[PDB]
Design a protein around this ligand. Structure first.
Ligand code: NAD
Ligand code: NAD
Ligand code: NAD
Ligand code: NAD
Lengths: 297, 297, 297, 297
């Protein structure tokens, strides 16, 4: 009873290294036999392809079977720009953006088409929020819109641009965070807002794309990725700790854990699931209180 | 813009003293001019009516206007028994149950009818759970069913028995607790389960009774009632503390607070609200983490 | 048991006429004795103040007591612009925007301050979405961002700009729609998304502002406003019909209905409610199926 | 990337034939290599084992690999009775119950232990509700309690009785229905209530058992199982039709579909998922309106 993505190909948007959720899903899709195409942020591209050439990610490419993951092709990409006319002359003039081409959503999509003709899976693992450090109360309109644009609308833009080249019976999947439904102080600059929009769109799109092309649309609401810090300082480190303490099952969360769920979800096994927000967070979201609250001892 | 329940009468099930949510709603309904009828648990009846005669609740009956609340009539009542044939000879033989009569749901309802002919508001403020101290894992089938019977089904039984005598455009309201949707360790013996059922039934009944008699059906999901203990020991004391610390608005919760919401809800002002779970818990339910978790300092 | 907003003042953002939810809440706040300040979209301002001068809204200003609603002051306002430096020379050059002044969020707020010094209630009744007619799949990035900006971020901008002048123990309230949580085909152009963000922000802000200034933050998730069309054509007309048929309580929805809930919510009676999404939609949101589905007869 | 339950054994409670969800999950678990133990209702036992002997289920036992499913052992079982002292002399005297032995939850569990020593997976596929045809308004207290007992508490009883013999890192899974969260007229007699309780308990137990033995606890909220009737008459037939029409993805639902999700969930791949209600209903739960409502054409 395997997850079989043999003869299927995925496009994974949001891979810059071996340390995020994105890398993890790729691994999983690859373990299940899918053909892997990557979309890399174009400021990040170089270092990415360079370390990959050099073998830097070799240990991070080991599959269960022991073989090594293959990335059939790396595509540069800035998901805040749909078409080329949209780019600010000042962006197209930046060294980084100067070094590559065909990096708009519309362009990436045209390439894939020209290169492979089709796809079966779409993975969104993107996000970005300039003022993510500030509270809403202190978030600028521009910093807020930026988070929404890169973190929400990007999914919409990708889905619509790739849809014409998705074989029906295909699936897409995106990564969300519970700061959409509940107050998680620290996750500011409109990221929370952006995660809320993403989720809702997940539903709508499941309708739009389900009816339109028989495509499944789902999002996975993950936990803080990683193991404990010797000194939990900063937001993520903190959440990791908090979650380790307060969750129904006491353990840490691994990328592998999120990737397997993803692979499952984009797989045929999951033919009856769409417009879902799946929690893969060690059951944290379900708790009413924190176990570690000082009142309880 | 007043809440006007002048010329309306409420039946409040679950009043044994001046210290619970039930007393609070009565006060509120009474401030708004409703005619107050009480249903008192029949083990509790005596002490109740006795202290009330004696003036023991006088300070607790003060209305805003300064006058004193009036209870038009106290009806004894055991909401685990619908009809008289249902009572175990061993219950009917107990001193307490021996002292009163017409205490089944079916009987109480017949009385009211014979005494007043009609009602407009129905308040459920009942609950009871023998093994509420044990974890589900350790809850007996009998202790579990008991919680459901007294805490869930009782609402269903009251609604159905009173419905024929409720003027259309009337409303009912019940008290719930968030341990239905989220894990709140400590609230065991099937109370959690019982609160879950109640809520769902709230919805269904809103459908059944809305369509049947133009009756609104809602539940209020409250916080731990009361102010701080010098030594928070025990479940409630603990929750009060926890909530005071961790809530979006830092303050305590008062019965008045729950009563006003109730009065509002059963009032005509609320003509577009039904099949709702209203949170009156200082916004606790909305939080993702506890502020007091030691990881955060 | 009245809703008393005597000696309180509200600022209502999003009044252009007597036909929306906004007008309704004002009425309600006014019935409860609050002092009414309006923020009018500045393209709409003129016609507004003109018809109001002329008596056009006289029948729509009748309060329950029989008297007539008073608007202490109308302030022009475009909630997509925070500070004056933000305005495009091409907007400031448009006849309409040319006729008025002090219309940025930052400016409106400064005025109020200079005119009244303070406020107690904040009402957001704003929304706008250029491509609201298109499906997400066909919504432009710009049309999507526009909906979010005018429909989501505007609340954030108002709250933050007015906060310094809100007496603690005050409240704000905004209008939402269930297309945030569930698929409602027809409500496109990112409005759905925008309603999702608003809700989430409602929660966060309740935290930010609750802790910061003892301000309550809530949103009301309303139904389609209005009575039946002889020919339900178009989105709203359709929803009205659908809701009339399928709701747990069969009736239409009136603005009065939404206004009363609002008044209640911003009132002191509601001191224990924050980070809530209150449904005032005749219980529609709670249903699992449509009664009118042809399968059921 | 397989779902590997090689060297694992499951106990499936609620198998009486090849036509329910229960049969389906067994198949799935079996495809993934788990060792299958069945708990059969003891009125149903005989016909079950008889047709199975005879080959009646042969076509229904075909695995993907082509081989045939094996049931290592069938255990009789009535999940409304925990211990033998609990049985009414009038039940133990009924032909059916007379023919078998060790059929209480406590007894079944002792047997398994004595026969296999341990288990890894626990599947609950049980339900039963005498007055399921009546509306709550017309449901008896006894008919209501019966639904809860057989449909809710049974899970609690099984979990607790099997827990001592579950290898840590194991999982349990139960089948729920959306009539718990939303009004689905027709699903009466307290089934709705019972499904609500089950879900909540799913959460709590995930806490209790997660912390206690490192066991994952989840429930799957399924759609109406089956394909279209030529004449949709009756509740299920109706729901199937309705769902086919109104769902985001237009298709029917197959048992296979629910089984695969289950297998996944009880599998190690799912190590970060617990206290979840997974929807496997073709995305129906996410919709706001019915597409087939006559208002929309
Ligand atoms: N990391 C966590 O603990 C956690 C928890 C919940 C959800 N998530 C979500 O997971 C996703 C990513 O996972 P992660 O945080 O592990 O990885 P990450 O931090 O690498 O994710 C951001 C990625 O997006 C890329 N990116 C940013 N802006 C871009 C733009 N304009 N165009 C194209 N690419 C751009 C970055 O280069 C990077 O690859 C996001 O959706 C994030 O919200 C993460
Ligand atoms: N107290 C809290 O902090 C809190 C929080 C959330 C919800 N609630 C709910 O509020 C309601 C009651 O409020 P409370 O706890 O303040 O008051 P309470 O403790 O007085 O409530 C129980 C009441 O039910 C009566 N009662 C018990 N069994 C009965 C039976 N078989 N027949 C008739 N009457 C019976 C008791 O005598 C008593 O009046 C319950 O629904 C409870 O779950 C309370
Ligand atoms: N009308 C309904 O059936 C319904 C249902 C649910 C929610 N709502 C919500 O109610 C609110 C408004 O109610 P309504 O639709 O009855 O009234 P409406 O249509 O008058 O609301 C829009 C208002 O915002 C103003 N406006 C638009 N863009 C603006 C900008 N940039 N700056 C300042 N003002 C601007 C308009 O002039 C108008 O007063 C919105 O939040 C809407 O989503 C309405
Ligand atoms: N069938 C559907 O469309 C659907 C939709 C959602 C959820 N479900 C749920 O799936 C589960 C079962 O699936 P199904 O309906 O396909 O199969 P089913 O109808 O065979 O389920 C009931 C099973 O429980 C057994 N049973 C009843 N009372 C018992 C008792 N006291 N002791 C022991 N066993 C007893 C029956 O013999 C039978 O095997 C239930 O949880 C049901 O609510 C089904």
């Amino acid at each position: 009873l395997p997850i079989d993505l043999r003869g299927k190909r995925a496009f994974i948007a949001g891979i810059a290294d071996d340390n995020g959720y994105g890398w993890a899903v790729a691994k999983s899709l690859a373990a299940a036999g899918a053909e892997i195409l990557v979309g890399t942020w174009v400021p990040a591209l170089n270092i990415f392809e360079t370390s990959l050439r050099r073998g830097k990610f070799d240990q991070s490419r080991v599959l269960p079977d022991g073989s090594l993951m293959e990335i059939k092709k790396v595509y540069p990409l800035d998901a805040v720009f749909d078409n080329p006319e949209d780019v600010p002359e000042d962006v197209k003039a930046n060294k980084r953006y100067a070094g590559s081409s065909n990096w708009t959503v519309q362009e990436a999509a045209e390439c894939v088409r020209q290169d492979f003709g089709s796809i079966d899976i779409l993975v969104h693992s993107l996000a970005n929020g300039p003022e993510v450090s500030k509270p809403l109360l202190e978030t600028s309109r521009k910093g807020y819109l930026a988070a929404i644009s890169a973190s929400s609308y990007s999914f919409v833009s990708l889905l619509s641009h790739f849809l014409p080249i998705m074989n029906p019976g295909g699936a897409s999947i995106s990564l969300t965070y519970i700061a959409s439904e509940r107050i998680i102080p620290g996750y500011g600059g409109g990221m929370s807002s952006a995660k809320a929009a993403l989720e809702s769109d997940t539903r709508v799109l499941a309708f739009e794309a389900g009816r339109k092309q028989n495509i499944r649309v789902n999002t996975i609401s993950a936990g803080p990725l990683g193991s404990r810090a010797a000194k939990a300082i900063g937001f993520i480190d903190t959440m990791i700790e908090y979650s380790y303490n307060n969750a129904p099952i006491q353990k840490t969360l691994t990328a592998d854990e999120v990737g397997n769920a993803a692979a499952f979800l984009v797989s045929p096994l999951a033919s009856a699931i769409t417009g879902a927000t799946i929690y893969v967070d060690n059951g944290l979201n379900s708790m009413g209180v924190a176990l570690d609250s000082p009142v309880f001892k």
